[PDB]
Structure formats: C-alpha cells, structure tokens
Amino acid sequence: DIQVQVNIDDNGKNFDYTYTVTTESELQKVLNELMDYIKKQGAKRVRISITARSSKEAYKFLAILAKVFAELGYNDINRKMTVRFRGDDLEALEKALKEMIRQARKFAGTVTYTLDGNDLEITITGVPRQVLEELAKEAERLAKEFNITITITVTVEGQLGSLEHHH
C-alpha cells in the first residue's frame, strides 16, 4: 500500500532501506525513527521516496516530506516524481504517455520515460513542489480516463541547512 525508501549518505559510507506499510500512522513512525537518528547522528545527505496510490496521498506525502526536512533544519535541495502506469491496451498506455509528458513540459518540467511490456514509467524533475502536486492530479485523472492502474512516487533529497535559515 505505502512504500517508503530511504537513502542516508553519511559520506565514505552509505545506507539504504525500505519499509512497506499500510497506514499513515506506520509511515509516520518510520519517519520519526529517522528524524531521531538524524538529529543525533547527522548525515551528509538524505533521500526519501514515498509511493502513493492516489494524488490525494501524493499531496499529503509531499506535505509530510516538507515537515520532516523542516524539523531537521534540512534544505530541500531536490525533488522529483515518478508516475508508473500499467495496462494491457498498448494504445491506451501510449495516450497516457503523450498527455502526461505534454502537461509536464507545459510546466517547464523535464521528463524521462520507459515503456516495457505492460509497465510504463515516467519521471519528472526540475519543478517546484506546487507543480508536482498538479501533475499528480493529472496523472490520477489520466489513469482513470484510460483505465490503467497508477503509482505515484514523490522523492525528496536534502542536506543540513544554515542555522540562520532554519530560524
């Protein structure tokens, strides 16, 4: 249901792990554990990905990543989104692609994509949080219009910021 992937770069070494969880509450408990660790041990850089089933959750997950970095005094240095569609009608899949990437380029975003069999993957970078929220809306919209399943991954990468900026 909900998948959260964490990369912690503690320079010279590197740690990756993933939990799958079913509620927002279990999600929060993973993030709390990670905040405690960061507060107490630090890191050169941290990357967090959360995979939603809907645009409402994606919106919520982006707001949750924001509080996480705020609390840590981390600067949001990097954000992206991966939409994954899956379908049997190739033609429907290719229509979803055509429109998904038009919209993203319309908001000055850069896209990357791969189509393989039933699975279709689109990564969007270089746009502010506000846009990724819209493009999630659009993605869910398109998934419904073409009757294809959909995944939404929001990804944030940050590092510890200035004392002055946190204040």
Numbering used by the authors: 3 to 169
Text lifted from the article:
Here, we explore the viability of such a mechanism by inserting one de novo designed alpha beta protein into another such that the two beta sheets are combined into one. Crystal structures of two such proteins demonstrate that complex beta sheet structures can be designed with considerable accuracy using this approach and provide a proof-of-concept for the hypothesis that complex beta topologies in natural proteins may have evolved from simpler beta sheet structures in a similar manner. Our success in designing larger beta sheet domains by recombining smaller independently folded beta sheet proteins suggests a similar mechanism could have played a role in the evolution of naturally occurring complex beta sheet proteins.
A first extended sheet protein was created by inserting a designed ferredoxin domain into a beta turn of the designed TOP7 protein to create a half-barrel structure, with the two sheets fused into a single seven strand sheet flanked by four helices. The CD spectra show both alpha and beta structures. The structure shows excellent agreement with the design model, particularly in low B-factor regions, with C-alpha RMSD ranging from 1.76 to 1.85 Å among the four protomers in the crystal. The most similar SCOP domains had weak TM-align scores (0.54 and 0.51), and the sheets in these matched structures have different connectivities than those of the designs, suggesting that the two designed proteins have novel folds. The beta strand connectivity is quite different in the designs than in these closest structural matches.
